[PDB]
Design a protein around this ligand. Structure first.
Ligand SMILES: [K+]
Ligand SMILES: [K+]
Ligand SMILES: [K+]
Ligand SMILES: [K+]
Ligand SMILES: [K+]
Ligand SMILES: [K+]
Ligand SMILES: [K+]
Ligand SMILES: [Mg+2]
Ligand SMILES: [Mg+2]
Ligand SMILES: [Mg+2]
Ligand SMILES: [Mg+2]
Ligand SMILES: [Mg+2]
Ligand SMILES: [Mg+2]
Ligand SMILES: [Mg+2]
Ligand SMILES: [Mg+2]
Ligand SMILES: [Mg+2]
Ligand SMILES: [Mg+2]
Ligand SMILES: [Mg+2]
Ligand SMILES: [Mg+2]
Ligand SMILES: [Mg+2]
Ligand SMILES: [Mg+2]
Ligand SMILES: [Mg+2]
Ligand SMILES: [Mg+2]
Ligand SMILES: [Mg+2]
Ligand SMILES: [Mg+2]
Ligand SMILES: [Mg+2]
Ligand SMILES: [Mg+2]
Ligand SMILES: [Mg+2]
Ligand SMILES: [Mg+2]
Ligand SMILES: [Mg+2]
Ligand SMILES: [Mg+2]
Ligand SMILES: [Mg+2]
Ligand SMILES: [Mg+2]
Ligand SMILES: [Mg+2]
Ligand SMILES: [Mg+2]
Ligand SMILES: [Mg+2]
Ligand SMILES: [Mg+2]
Ligand SMILES: [Mg+2]
Ligand SMILES: [Mg+2]
Ligand SMILES: [Mg+2]
Ligand SMILES: [Mg+2]
Ligand SMILES: [Mg+2]
Ligand SMILES: [Mg+2]
Ligand SMILES: [Mg+2]
Ligand SMILES: [Mg+2]
Ligand SMILES: [Mg+2]
Ligand SMILES: [Mg+2]
Ligand SMILES: [Mg+2]
Ligand SMILES: [Mg+2]
Ligand SMILES: [Mg+2]
Ligand SMILES: [Mg+2]
Ligand SMILES: [Mg+2]
Ligand SMILES: [Mg+2]
Ligand SMILES: [Mg+2]
Ligand SMILES: [Mg+2]
Ligand SMILES: [Mg+2]
Ligand SMILES: [Mg+2]
Ligand SMILES: [Mg+2]
Ligand SMILES: [Mg+2]
Ligand SMILES: [Mg+2]
Ligand SMILES: [Mg+2]
Ligand SMILES: [Mg+2]
Ligand SMILES: [Mg+2]
Lengths: 142, 129, 150
RNA sequence: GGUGACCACGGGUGACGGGGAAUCAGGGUUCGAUUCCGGAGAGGGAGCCUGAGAAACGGCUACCACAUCCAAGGAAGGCAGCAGGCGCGCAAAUUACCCACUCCCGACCCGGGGAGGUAGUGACGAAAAAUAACAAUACAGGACUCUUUCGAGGCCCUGUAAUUGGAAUGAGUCCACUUUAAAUCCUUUAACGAGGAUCCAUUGGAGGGCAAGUCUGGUGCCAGCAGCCGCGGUAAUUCCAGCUCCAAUAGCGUAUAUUAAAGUUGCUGCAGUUAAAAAGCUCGUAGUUGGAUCUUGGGAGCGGGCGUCCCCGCCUUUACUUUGAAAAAAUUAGAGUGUUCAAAGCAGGCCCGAGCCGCCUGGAUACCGCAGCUAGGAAUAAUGGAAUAGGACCGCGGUUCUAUUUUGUUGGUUUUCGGAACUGAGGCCAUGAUUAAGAGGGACGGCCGGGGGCAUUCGUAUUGCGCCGCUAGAGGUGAAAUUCUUGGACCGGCGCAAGACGGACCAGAGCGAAAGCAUUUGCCAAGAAUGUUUUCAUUAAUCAAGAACGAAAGUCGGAGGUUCGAAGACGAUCAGAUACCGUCGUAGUUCCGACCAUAAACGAUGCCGACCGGCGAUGCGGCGGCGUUAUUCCCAUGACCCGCCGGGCAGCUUCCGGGAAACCAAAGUCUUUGGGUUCCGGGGGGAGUAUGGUUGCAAAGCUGAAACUUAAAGGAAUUGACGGAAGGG
RNA sequence: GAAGACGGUCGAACUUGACUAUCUAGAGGAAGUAAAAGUCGUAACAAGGUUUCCGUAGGUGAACCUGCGGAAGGAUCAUUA
RNA sequence: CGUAUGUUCAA
């Protein structure tokens, strides 16, 4: 069992320090590799340029074509796949547009049936996807 | 090896108490054991006990009254200040209505309520309820 | 249990409660202490000296008859061994095991037992050095230890 | 020399430090660039002048980077001050007014201050708070009483851009007035200003978790939704819509860091037989932990709160505990106080009559860890005093040294004087050593064991060979064939040679730290247990580093090579058969010497210690006891029988108790949670992979990540189904 | 008493080299992961049709097969003087 | 003696 002597504060402190590296929640935030590898670089959002529109096949047991875009982030040049939510929102997006991208809500993990997509589009052409979807504003037509 | 005679004694009393025995043999015996037993006697949790002299550490035979729920030792003997005594009571005793924490203080070995009255903190020995 | 074995044996001596000398012992404290001197001078270890006194002279505990332990009696008379008997016997065993290994180098068991024996020697010698019984720099030299014992 | 496993040195830091912030059972986790204090820097370094004070940058000099002007000779620069621009980004305001406040500098009551104040932008965040209210008619409905139960009357209440009706008001606009340095907003006021009071509340959701439709239309595993489970394949409670309803509300949704939830980092307080996990095993230094034992019944008054009880007492080690001092403010808790309430602020309140010098106040308090300091306590834990007495204490005799004094006309003092050393003889102390641990070491005694090493001996079998006999087959298999064979195979007999192996006896038996260990005899050293009125006296437990041993396979050098047999060859089998089957057969298997360090190295279960039910055995040791048998009688000793004790391998039973259960007398003595200590797990993968280090002849061993991916993977047990499983039909 | 100079000191900076940290290009090579309806076999799950699994070693399209030692998490808690 | 296999989702 664990040591309990009155002079074991160092041993108990040292052991908890070592064993704290063995849960991925701590090692993700305290190693630095995760932050370096993070496409957003520790940011909640990131801007980028739509390289192309791509369709992702939904995982079994579902069947659908999830609409996404390949985006190259401005701040670091990394390439990510961002899901485009809602029914006809992919039509608003065109090639080589500035898009504000956010996370999918699972802190760096895929959400639902879309395989390997960890990001979603919030604004396109500096106008919100929701306001476009709800008819508040229109794709900056020049 | 045996690092704590008091731990061995209190565990032996606890096991015989749960088994419904009327008497328990305690070996070896120490002043700390006898003073601890006396604190339980003054509160009625155990009956008379007879220390037996063997020109050695000593053996004891305790008469059990079927009143102990648990007599446990605390290792190591943490230093207990008066302010921290309440947080020890909430952690070691089933309620404040009964049960005692045995402290070794400069004044002497005593329960937690007598220590509060004498305004002396000390090192914790064990508890019973 | 044993420090260098899995055994948990209990065999030992149970000393009686009564420390007083019995009435049937006609041997006085001095007379017993002079008999100790003959046996130690004859080359017997304190351990052995107690057996001859207990087996044939009725002296159950020299300490009870004389008030002093045998080794403590021998120290006063100057007959005490240079090396403590327990340490001496562990060194003697190590020499015998090491003699066996020189001619039986395939005896991996004897190699294992020797490490245990030398471990007990160092634990014992560490204790004697602390209580200042052995010089502050006594070291067991397996090469030169054969001359000390037998 | 100094520093280091009590972590030095080196590296990292999305590190300025603290007061503090968020979260809150207790313990704790995270944040602290940021208005207060401390520090540091002014594009990067360096060097300086002046000055009390600077290594100053709204000082200078040089260099470096960048950059401006030029007539090309030169000259000039520093916003991490306030604005403002650009760039970067997910990400942050006016090139506004003022010294009135607050305070600072100066020769100074007078000047100045982008310090600071004021307004602007401002859904960062916080506080207060509209978006109606009422009355009657109406229609259901309750409601209150009576009555044929029905029914009726008045009355209270609710749904209706119901039918209305006229009351009220502030958002708004807008005189003045106040505010203020000047303004502003707020506060007040006059005017005006509400019926669809269109002066029109949103954002999310409506299968579950989780409050709210199985309404209607559209689509048809598409489009989409969906944090998770899941919805959608032509009647979708989930998509897209309409209607309705629900949640919060001037605010809601989403992303991301972090906290609780997480006893999912466990000190409190988790796990490690089977779910993830105890190192193959042992030794061992740091570390951690460590048996018992030294003044306790103690005059009370220190009662009758009656006691042969009491709170009260009076028969200078270290940790610890109690106390006192000092510990910025703000923040936090908290007292007072109608900011109108409130977040806030530190104000306010009484008395009108004279303010004759108005009075009456408040501007608390607590916490400030650790260390340090102070004064008590003396249990607990550690440590020390006499053992070659080099001992405590009391006086005694000497050999010495030095200041003051004890002689005030000097000096010599007649000096004495006390202290500090060395030294001798004494007396005296009850003279001085706790115990001997169901802790350990060691001695001895008689045993005991497939424990280890060396040598030796025997056994039959397998294979080969020689001779002899008879004979045509033998072998092998599911069937075969490869194969051996009248050159006589196989089989039978005799004999020889080699190498391996040690059957049966052989057990839920023994021994060893594990790995492992079995023919006889000899030799060598070792070991547990038991027995002991022997000895030592805490010498111990566990263990980072470190070290010995470590099946099999594998590797290196030498010897040997029967048997088996990776590889290989072949014959079968088969759709194929690189296999299972068969015939051969290399390495190896064997001995010696050097490596290797891994196994389902398993009891998948660390070690040491204590306690907790019963029963029959069993092996070792000892003790006791009818009887049987041999030892010819005796004696003891063996074989057997009946018990006991101790150490061990186990077994049965049990509602000890535990556990998810299987089960476990330990895997129990655990929310009634703490004997000591080592290793080690934190969803499944990626992966024991990459990479660096290290070891190795090699094979590899050890140490050991990350990116990314995923909503299960897994344990135990249940019911079914299935089985080229069994049993009965 | 100015310019100026020998020497000393502090010493930016520049060149060269060394060490180190991070990022990054790369023919080719060799992995891993994901993905509604690909090809070859059938290795594991029942005695999975050769019980399975561990270590080690060799071999083969691929799962795997084979040798040697081990485990039962087995398909046996048991086999009789 | 001797044989292998059974497209995706769906109660
Ligand atoms: K001013
Ligand atoms: K709907
Ligand atoms: K708790
Ligand atoms: K023959
Ligand atoms: K037994
Ligand atoms: K089943
Ligand atoms: K499907
Ligand atoms: Mg976690
Ligand atoms: Mg699919
Ligand atoms: Mg579906
Ligand atoms: Mg999923
Ligand atoms: Mg022994
Ligand atoms: Mg040990
Ligand atoms: Mg013994
Ligand atoms: Mg920094
Ligand atoms: Mg910080
Ligand atoms: Mg700060
Ligand atoms: Mg910063
Ligand atoms: Mg500051
Ligand atoms: Mg400065
Ligand atoms: Mg700058
Ligand atoms: Mg400067
Ligand atoms: Mg400036
Ligand atoms: Mg300045
Ligand atoms: Mg600026
Ligand atoms: Mg002025
Ligand atoms: Mg409105
Ligand atoms: Mg829901
Ligand atoms: Mg509901
Ligand atoms: Mg339809
Ligand atoms: Mg857990
Ligand atoms: Mg496991
Ligand atoms: Mg183990
Ligand atoms: Mg140690
Ligand atoms: Mg103790
Ligand atoms: Mg407050
Ligand atoms: Mg045999
Ligand atoms: Mg090690
Ligand atoms: Mg070795
Ligand atoms: Mg081997
Ligand atoms: Mg070999
Ligand atoms: Mg060889
Ligand atoms: Mg073939
Ligand atoms: Mg063969
Ligand atoms: Mg291993
Ligand atoms: Mg294991
Ligand atoms: Mg050990
Ligand atoms: Mg035995
Ligand atoms: Mg626990
Ligand atoms: Mg994991
Ligand atoms: Mg490596
Ligand atoms: Mg799923
Ligand atoms: Mg498993
Ligand atoms: Mg197989
Ligand atoms: Mg198969
Ligand atoms: Mg098989
Ligand atoms: Mg199987
Ligand atoms: Mg092959
Ligand atoms: Mg093969
Ligand atoms: Mg197929
Ligand atoms: Mg098919
Ligand atoms: Mg199928
Ligand atoms: Mg169906």
């Amino acid at each position: 069992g664990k040591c309990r002597g009155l002079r074991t504060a160092r041993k108990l402190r040292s052991h908890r320090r070592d064993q704290k590296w063995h849960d991925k929640q701590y090692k993700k935030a305290h190693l630095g590799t995760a932050l370096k590898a993070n496409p957003f670089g520790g940011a909640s959002h990131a801007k980028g340029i739509v390289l192309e529109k791509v369709g992702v096949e939904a995982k079994q047991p579902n069947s659908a074509i999830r609409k996404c875009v390949r985006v190259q982030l401005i701040k670091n040049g990394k390439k990510i796949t961002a899901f485009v939510p809602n029914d006809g929102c992919l039509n608003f997006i065109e090639e080589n547009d500035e898009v504000l991208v956010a996370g999918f809500g699972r802190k760096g993990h895929a959400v639902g049936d879309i395989p390997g997509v960890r990001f979603k589009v919030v604004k396109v052409a500096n106008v919100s996807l929701l306001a476009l979807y709800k008819g508040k504003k229109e794709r900056p037509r020049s | 090896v045996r690092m704590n005679v008091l731990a061995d004694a209190l565990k032996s009393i606890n096991n015989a108490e749960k088994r419904g025995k009327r008497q328990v043999l305690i070996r070896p015996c120490s002043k700390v054991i006898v003073r601890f037993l006396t604190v339980m006697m003054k509160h009625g949790y155990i009956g008379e006990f007879e220390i037996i002299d063997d020109h050695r550490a000593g053996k004891i035979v305790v008469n059990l009254t079927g009143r102990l729920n648990k007599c446990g030792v605390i290792s190591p003997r943490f230093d207990v200040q008066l302010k921290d005594l309440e947080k020890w009571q909430n952690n070691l005793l089933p309620s404040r209505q009964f049960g005692f924490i045995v402290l070794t203080t400069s004044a002497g070995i005593m329960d937690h309520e007598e220590a509060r009255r004498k305004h002396t903190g000390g090192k914790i020995l064990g508890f019973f309820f | 249990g044993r420090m260098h074995a899995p055994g948990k044996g209990l065999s030992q001596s149970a000393l009686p409660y009564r420390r007083s000398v019995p009435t049937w012992l006609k041997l006085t404290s001095d007379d017993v202490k002079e008999q100790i001197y003959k046996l130690a001078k004859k080359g017997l270890t304190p351990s052995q000296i107690g057996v001859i006194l207990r087996d044939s002279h009725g002296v159950a505990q020299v300490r009870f008859v004389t008030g002093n332990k045998i080794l403590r009696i021998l120290k006063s008379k100057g007959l005490a061994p240079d090396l403590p008997e327990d340490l001496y016997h562990l060194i003697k065993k190590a020499v015998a095991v090491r003699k066996h290994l020189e001619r039986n180098r395939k005896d991996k068991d004897a190699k294992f037992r020797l490490i245990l024996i030398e471990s007990r020697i160092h634990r014992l010698a560490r204790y004697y050095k602390t209580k200042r019984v052995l010089p502050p720099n006594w070291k067991y030299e397996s090469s030169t230890a054969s001359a000390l014992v037998a």
